[PDB]
Amino acid sequence: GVQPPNFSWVLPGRLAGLALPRLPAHYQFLLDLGVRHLVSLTERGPPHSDSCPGLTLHRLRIPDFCPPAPDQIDRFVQIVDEANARGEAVGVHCALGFGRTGTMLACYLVKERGLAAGDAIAEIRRLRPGSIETYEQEKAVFQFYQRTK
């Protein structure tokens, strides 16, 4: 197994972020750490994902340099909740693992850890320096918090 680029846990044993996986060894690495679900945010599916039939790919396509749509975030949350309900960890990736990935990660903290948007964005940036760099990305988290209370 080979650790995928920019990989790190946000919620130990439950949720992790990563850059674009592109080799069979990347997916095998995820499976070894218990990450049985991969939420893919890129415009196209990541290469060689089918090498590991045991890993479930969840395609939630979000255009490059754009924020996630409200319904997409709700779906992301649902996916993480159901996976963790089965004792399985989830990994979420985009192209670089900072923008779209960072926004999703922060949104789960808002929902699952009850954090305010600002603090959720700060924690993600602390764990993964460089995350949620754009205003639209921050905006996505704040509006999610607004409809999550």
Swiss-Prot record:
Function summary: Protein phosphatase that mediates dephosphorylation of proteins phosphorylated on Tyr and Ser/Thr residues. In vitro, it can dephosphorylate p44-ERK1 (MAPK3) but not p54 SAPK-beta (MAPK10) in vitro. Able to enhance activation of JNK and p38 (MAPK14).
SUPFAM superfamilies (UniProt xref): (Phosphotyrosine protein) phosphatases II
GO function terms (MF aspect): phosphatase activity; protein serine/threonine phosphatase activity; protein tyrosine phosphatase activity; protein tyrosine/serine/threonine phosphatase activity
Protein EC: 3.1.3.16, 3.1.3.48
GO CC terms, sorted: cytoplasm; cytosol; nucleoplasm
Entry annotated with the keyword Hydrolase: yes
PROSITE patterns in the cross-refs: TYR_PHOSPHATASE_1, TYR_PHOSPHATASE_2, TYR_PHOSPHATASE_DUAL
Enzyme active site: C94
GO biological process, one term: dephosphorylation
TM regions (residue ranges): none
Protein name (record): Dual specificity protein phosphatase 23
Tissue expression profile of the protein: Widely expressed. Highly expressed in spleen, prostate, colon, adrenal gland, mammary gland, thyroid and trachea. Expressed at lower level in uterus, small intestine, bladder, bone marrow, brain, spinal cord and stomach.
InterPro entries on file: Prot-tyrosine_phosphatase-like, PTP, PTP-SAK, Tyr_Pase_AS, Tyr_Pase_cat, Tyr_Pase_dom, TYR_PHOSPHATASE_DUAL_dom
Cellular location(s): Cytoplasm, Cytosol; Nucleus
Keywords: Cytoplasm, Hydrolase, Nucleus, Protein phosphatase
Protein family according to the UniProt entry: Belongs to the protein-tyrosine phosphatase family. Non-receptor class dual specificity subfamily.
Residue ranges constituting the Tyrosine-protein phosphatase domain according to the UniProt record: 6-149
Catalysis: reaction(s): O-phospho-L-tyrosyl-[protein] + H2O = L-tyrosyl-[protein] + phosphate; O-phospho-L-seryl-[protein] + H2O = L-seryl-[protein] + phosphate; O-phospho-L-threonyl-[protein] + H2O = L-threonyl-[protein] + phosphate
Domain of life: Eukaryota
Gene this chain is encoded by: DUSP23
